[PDB]
Amino acid sequence: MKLSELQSHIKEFDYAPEQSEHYFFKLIEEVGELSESIRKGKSGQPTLDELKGSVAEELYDVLYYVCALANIHGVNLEKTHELKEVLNKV
Amino acid sequence: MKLSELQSHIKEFDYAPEQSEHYFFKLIEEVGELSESIRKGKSGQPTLDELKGSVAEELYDVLYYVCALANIHGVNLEKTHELKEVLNKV
Amino acid sequence: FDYAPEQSEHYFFKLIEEVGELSESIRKGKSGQPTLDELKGSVAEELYDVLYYVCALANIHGVNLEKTHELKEVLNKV
Amino acid sequence: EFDYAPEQSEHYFFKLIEEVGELSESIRKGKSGQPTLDELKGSVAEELYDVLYYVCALANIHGVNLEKTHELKEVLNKV
Ligand SMILES: [Mg+2]
Ligand SMILES: [Mg+2]
Ligand SMILES: [Mg+2]
Ligand SMILES: [Mg+2]
C-alpha cells in the first residue's frame, strides 16, 4: 500500500473540497477517540473482531482524515515527506 | 513511499517504547499546529521555502506521530488498513 | 489519585476525549441551551465537560486560574 | 469583532485546538505551578487559561449558559 495510493484511494471515495470543515471536525473526533483507546490500554494488533475501539482502529481513523485533509488542501503527502527528508539532512 | 516502510523508517530513528506519553503529547502539539495552518489558509503543495508552517508540513508531522504511536503500541497500520477495508465493504 | 503524574495523564486523556466529543456536537449543530432531555450530546454538555478537565488539570498542576486571568489582563493592557 | 456566526464559531474552534496543542507542550515540559509574570509565557497556567478562554468564547456564540449547564449536569449525576 503506497501512501500516495492510500491518499488517492481515499480521494476516489470521499472528496468534498467545499466541506473542509467536515473533515477537520472529523480529524478532531478521531483524535478524541484515539485518546480514549490509549487511556484504556487497547494496544497491540487486533483481529477483525477486536478492531472496534482499539488503538489500531483509531490510529487508522486519524490517518484516514490526515489523508482526506491532504486531498482537500491540495497536499501531496509523499512529496511533502520527501521535502522533510531534505530538511532533516541539512 | 510504502506505508509499512514509513512506519519502519520512523522506528529506526525514533523508537522509545517506555515514553508512550512523549508521543501522544507530540501528536496533540502537531494537531494544534495543523489547526493554525488551516486557520491561516496555508494550503497547496509548498516548495522548500514555503514548507515551515504550511498545512502540508503539519499534516505530515501529524502523520509522523500516528506512525510513531503505531510502532509504540504494536500496531501494523497496513494490516489495520486491510481489516478496515473488509468492514467498510460489508 | 495520589501519584500526581498519573492524575495529570488521566485528566489530559479526558480533555482530548471531550474536545473530540465537542467537535462532533459542533459538526451536528447541537447549539443553544438545552433542557435536561437534550443535554446529552449537546454543545453545552461538551463545553462544560472540557471546562471540567481544564479545571481538574489546574488543580493537579498547582494552577490558580483566577490569578492567571489577572496576570493575562496586565499583558493585555500592555 | 465577528458578524456571521458560523465564521466566529469556526475561528474559536481553530483557536481552541491550537491552545490544546500548546497545553500539551507545556505539560510535556513540566511547566507546572503558578508562575509570576516572567514565567507565564509557555507555562501550563497560561495554556489552561487560553483553553478556558475559547471554551467560554465558544459558549457565548453557541448560546450556552455554562452555569445552568453545570447545574443540569449535577441533577443528572445525582440521579
Ligand atoms: Mg473512530
Ligand atoms: Mg509542526
Ligand atoms: Mg462528553
Ligand atoms: Mg497559548
Resolution of the experimental model, in Å, one decimal? 2.2
Closest in D11, D14, D20 to B28, CB measured:
D20
The Cα–Cα gap between B47 and C11 comes to: 40
Contact D48, C61 (CB under 8 A): yes
Q: Which amino acid is at A41?
A: G
Experimental method: X-ray
Contact C63, D44 (CB under 8 A): yes
The continuous run of DSSP H or E covering A75 comes out as none
The Cα–Cα gap between C45 and C52 comes to: 10
Instruction: Kindly report the number of other CB atoms within 10 A of residue D49's CB atom.
Output: 23
Please tell me whether residue B2 adopts helix, strand or coil conformation.
strand
Distances (CA, A) of A13 to B68, B76, D53: 27, 23, 38
For residue C55, what are the contacts with CB-CB under 8 A and spacing of at least 6?
C65
The Cα–Cα gap between B72 and B29 comes to: 18
Contact D52, C65 (CB under 8 A): yes
The Cα–Cα gap between B85 and A57 comes to: 12
Give the domain ranges of chain B.
Answer: 1-90
Q: Which of B19, B23, B33, B59 to mutate to test the interface with A (most CBs of A within 10 A)?
A: B59
The Cα–Cα gap between A32 and A25 comes to: 11
Grid cell for residue D35: 508562575
Please name the residue that has the C-alpha cell 443540569. Answer: D72
- Residues in chain D within 8 Å Cβ distance of C47: 55, 58-59, 62, 64, 66, 69
The fold of D1-79 is: Helix Hairpins (1.10.287)
The fold of C1-78 is: Helix Hairpins (1.10.287)
Please name the residue that has the C-alpha cell 433542557. Answer: C35
Which residue, among B55, B89, B71, has the nearest Cα to B14 in the 3D structure? B71
Residue B20 CA, ligand 3 centroid: distance in Å: 25
Distances (CA, A) of B29 to A5, A40, B65: 27, 21, 10
What's the CATH code, domain A1-90? Answer: 1.10.287.1080
